[PDB]
Amino acid sequence: PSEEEEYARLVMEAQPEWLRAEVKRLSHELAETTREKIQAAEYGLAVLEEKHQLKLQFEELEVDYEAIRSEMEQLKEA
Amino acid sequence: LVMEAQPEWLRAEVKRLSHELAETTREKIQAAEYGLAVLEEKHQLKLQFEELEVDYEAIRSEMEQLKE
Amino acid sequence: EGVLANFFNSLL
């Protein structure tokens, strides 16, 4: 029997004291994973924002580069 | 009376939490894999930014060198 | 990338 059918048999045939402990155990597991899920989504928004700022900082540098390069090209007529 | 014949509620709770825990784990993993992808993207972009900085300095110093 | 931020907020 796989671990899954063995667990299914446990739940449908174990005593209430066991069922109550599993309920408790899964409640801790779900609370912890919900905490980790939330921190992952915050991490994502933070790095998404850092990336956004970096993109603006980049495009800003692109404009400053073009201005200088534009001027230089003009100068090579002298 | 003997509503106490209630392991059917416990059993319902075990299965509810098991499913919620599975979806919360998918969402968590999915979230984490997206976080990694942004880090990868930001890394490529940081590399490109520092390239442009260098080239920017290259032609700020190559002009100014235009000196008369 | 608005899809990522939407997914991220939907988890909060």
Author numbering:
A (entry chain A): 4 to 81
B (entry chain B): 13 to 80
C (entry chain C): 441 to 452
Task: Reproduce, without paraphrasing, sentences from the article in which this PDB structure was first reported.
A 2.4-Å resolution structure of human BICD21–98 in complex with human LIC1433–458 was determined ab initio using the single-wavelength anomalous dispersion method from crystals of selenomethionine-substituted BICD21–98. The electron density map reveals residues P4–A81 of one chain and L13–E80 of the other chain of BICD2, and residues E441–L452 of a single LIC1 helix. The uninterrupted coiled-coil segment of BICD2 comprises residues P19–L78, displaying the characteristic heptad repeat. At the N-terminus, one of the BICD2 chains is disordered, whereas the other chain contains an additional helix (residues E6–E16) that runs antiparallel to the coiled-coil helices. The LIC1 helix binds near the middle of the BICD2 coiled-coil segment and is oriented diagonally with respect to the axis of the coiled-coil. Critical to the formation of this pocket is the presence of highly conserved alanine and glycine residues in the CC1-box that, based on the structure, can be more precisely defined as consisting of human BICD2 residues 39EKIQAAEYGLAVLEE53 (where, bold letters indicate residue conservation ≥50% among 100 CC1-box-containing sequences). In particular, residues A43 and G47 occupy “d” and “a” positions within the hydrophobic core of the heptad repeat and, because of their unusually small size for these positions, they help create a cavity for the binding of the LIC1 helix. The presence of a single LIC1 helix bound to BICD2 in the structure is surprising, since previous analysis suggested two binding sites. However, the second LIC1-binding site, predicted to be symmetrically positioned on the opposite side of the BICD2 coiled-coil from the one observed in the structure, is masked by a crystal packing contact. In contrast, Y46DZIP+/WTZIP− bound a single LIC1 helix (N = 1.1) with KD ~ 6.2 μM. These results conclusively show that BICD2 and likely other CC1-box-containing adaptors have the ability to interact with two LIC1 helices and with similar low-micromolar affinities.
